[PDB]
Amino acid sequence: PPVLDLGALGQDFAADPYPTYARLRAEGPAHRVRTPEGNEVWLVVGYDRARAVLADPRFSKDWRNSTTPLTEAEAALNHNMLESDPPRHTRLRKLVAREFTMRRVELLRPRVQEIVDGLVDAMLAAPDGRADLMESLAWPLPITVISELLGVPEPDRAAFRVWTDAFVFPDDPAQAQTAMAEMSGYLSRLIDSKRGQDGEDLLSALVRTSDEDGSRLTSEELLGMAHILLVAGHETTVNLIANGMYALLSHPDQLAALRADMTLLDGAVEEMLRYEGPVESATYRFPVEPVDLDGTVIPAGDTVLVVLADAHRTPERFPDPHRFDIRRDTAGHLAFGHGIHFCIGAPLARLEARIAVRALLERCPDLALDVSPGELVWYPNPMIRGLKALPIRWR
Numbered sequence: 268p269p270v271l272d273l274g275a276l277g278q279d280f281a282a283d284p285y286p287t288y289a290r291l292r293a294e295g296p297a298h299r300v301r302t303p304e305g306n307e308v309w310l311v312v313g314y315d316r317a318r319a320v321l322a323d324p325r326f327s328k329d330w331r332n333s334t335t336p337l338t339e340a341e342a343a344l345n346h347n348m349l350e351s352d353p354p355r356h357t358r359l360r361k362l363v364a365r366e367f368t369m370r371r372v373e374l375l376r377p378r379v380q381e382i383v384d385g386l387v388d389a390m391l392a393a394p395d396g397r398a399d400l401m402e403s404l405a406w407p408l409p410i411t412v413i414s415e416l417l418g419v420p421e422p423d424r425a426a427f428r429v430w431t432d433a434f435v436f437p438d439d440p441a442q443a444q445t446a447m448a449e450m451s452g453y454l455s456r457l458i459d460s461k462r463g464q465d466g467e468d469l470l471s472a473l474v475r476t477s478d479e480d481g482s483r484l485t486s487e488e489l490l491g492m493a494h495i496l497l498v499a500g501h502e503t504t505v506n507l508i509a510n511g512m513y514a515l516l517s518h519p520d521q522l523a524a525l526r527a528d529m530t531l532l533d534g535a536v537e538e539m540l541r542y543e544g545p546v547e548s549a550t551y552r553f554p555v556e557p558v559d560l561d562g563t564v565i566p567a568g569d570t571v572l573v574v575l576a577d578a579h580r581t582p583e584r585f586p587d588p589h590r591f592d593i594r595r596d597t598a599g600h601l602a603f604g605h606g607i608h609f610c611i612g613a614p615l616a617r618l619e620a621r622i623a624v625r626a627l628l629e630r631c632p633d634l635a636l637d638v639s640p641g642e643l644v645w646y647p648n649p650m651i652r653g654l655k656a657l658p659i660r661w662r
């Protein structure tokens with residue numbers, strides 16, 4: 268079959284990619300596409316095959332296994348655990364695994380609660396009882412939490428929304444590359460500013476680790492670590508909060524059920540992940556050798572994107588897939604991935620989303636979507652499922 272041009276859609280395809288993916292899945296697990304940006308990649312669709320490929324060591328994450336060239340700015344940031352295989356992956360993840368356990372993350376709850384409380388305070392001061400939920404809460408919450416953990420100073424934080432807007436939806440490819448070079452330059456200076464300062468934030472601890480033994484964490488890896496810990500959880504958590512609140516406000520029966528029984532909160536957040544999680548397609552995977560998927564052979568070195576969004580709409584795995592049901596059995600969803608790269612941030616993301624969702628329901632009487640669903644606009648990006656704005660209102 269010819270390469271499917273996703274740009275030529277659709278539209279449209281950004282607003283509702285699901286029928287496109289489903290049509291592909293009916294034909295088989297693996298498809299050549301051209302993304303709206305213009306890149307020729309493979310999509311893997313269908314829950315069982317997506318789950319298998321996420322964890323299959325035949326599919327590498329190390330760019331040395333890719334035939335796609337990297338720009339200088341891109342290459343400077345790729346020595347990180349998500350863009351590594353064992354043994355490098357194993358070594359890098361061990362340096363920070365203890366910081367992100369459920370137990371350690373649970374210690375942040377009072378502070379996360381305080382941040383949320385103050386953002387909702389500020390939101391509810393609006394004299395017209397209207398806000399954009401992105402601006403008021405979904406954007407500032409995750410950046411505040413992760414900045415405090417890592418040690419990014421408050422005046423430095425606004426620059427990250429500008430850079431992430433550029434990575435997500437860039438005026439042209441060159442502004443994404445400038446954003447990258449700037450962010451890398453900034454992080455290197457931030458890292459340098461910690462040296463000798465006896466800071467106790469995570470970035471300071473990583474700097475001492477690297478300085479004490481460059482074989483345990485090299486200077487490139489120190490920069491890649493600050494980068495991945497900041498970027499991997501940013502656009503994702505922001506959009507979990509926004510997509511999830513959208514799901515709730517556009518399914519009032521479910522909103523009412525959760526209001527009526529707040530013990531349903533954790534399962535509601537799991538169904539937000541399943542139903543409309545922020546990661547539409549996983550990060551790039553590169554076969555180390557050719558891989559046959561049901562008669563379709565993907566060449567060594569090609570780019571493969573696992574379509575988590577389609578996995579989650581596979582009816583054999585999640586019956587009545589297009590129903591948002593906060594009581595659904597969500598076990599096995601792929602929203603945080605699967606296998607050795609499974610999200611290290613999952614406990615922190617869940618903590619943030621659960622506290623945010625609870626705060627909004629509890630403190631916004633008659634909370635409502637303030638435009639019709641058809642008026643919302645989704646960013647076109649093939650990796651991220653995320654809204655431009657989320658107008659809400661309350662009483």
Ligand code: HEM
Nearest residue numbers: 348349499500503504507549550603604608610611612616
């Ligand atoms: C709801 C929010 C989040 C979602 C949906 C999410 C999703 C994911 C997914 C799908 C992967 C695997 C990607 C792949 O295999 O190609 C991943 C990995 C990762 N995530 Fe998360 N993430 C979220 C929040 C966070 C946060 C808050 C942090 C950091 C504090 C974080 C840090 C990371 C890191 C460092 C990796 C790479 C792990 C590894 O390679 O071993 N994420 N995430």
Ligand SMILES: CC[C@H]1OC(=O)[C@H](C)C(=O)[C@@H](C)[C@@H](O[C@@H]2O[C@H](C)C[C@H](N(C)C)[C@H]2O)[C@@H](C)C[C@@H](C)C(=O)/C=C/[C@H]1C
Nearest residue numbers: 349434435443444447495498499502503546550648650651
């Ligand atoms: C949960 C994983 C997050 O993605 C990542 O952590 C990876 C490492 C990542 O940073 C890349 C996917 C970024 O994408 C690349 O960005 C460059 C500017 C250009 C490059 N090119 C091929 C288009 C592009 O793939 C990432 C900054 C993309 C944005 C949307 C993002 O924030 C993703 C976050 C998670 C999906």
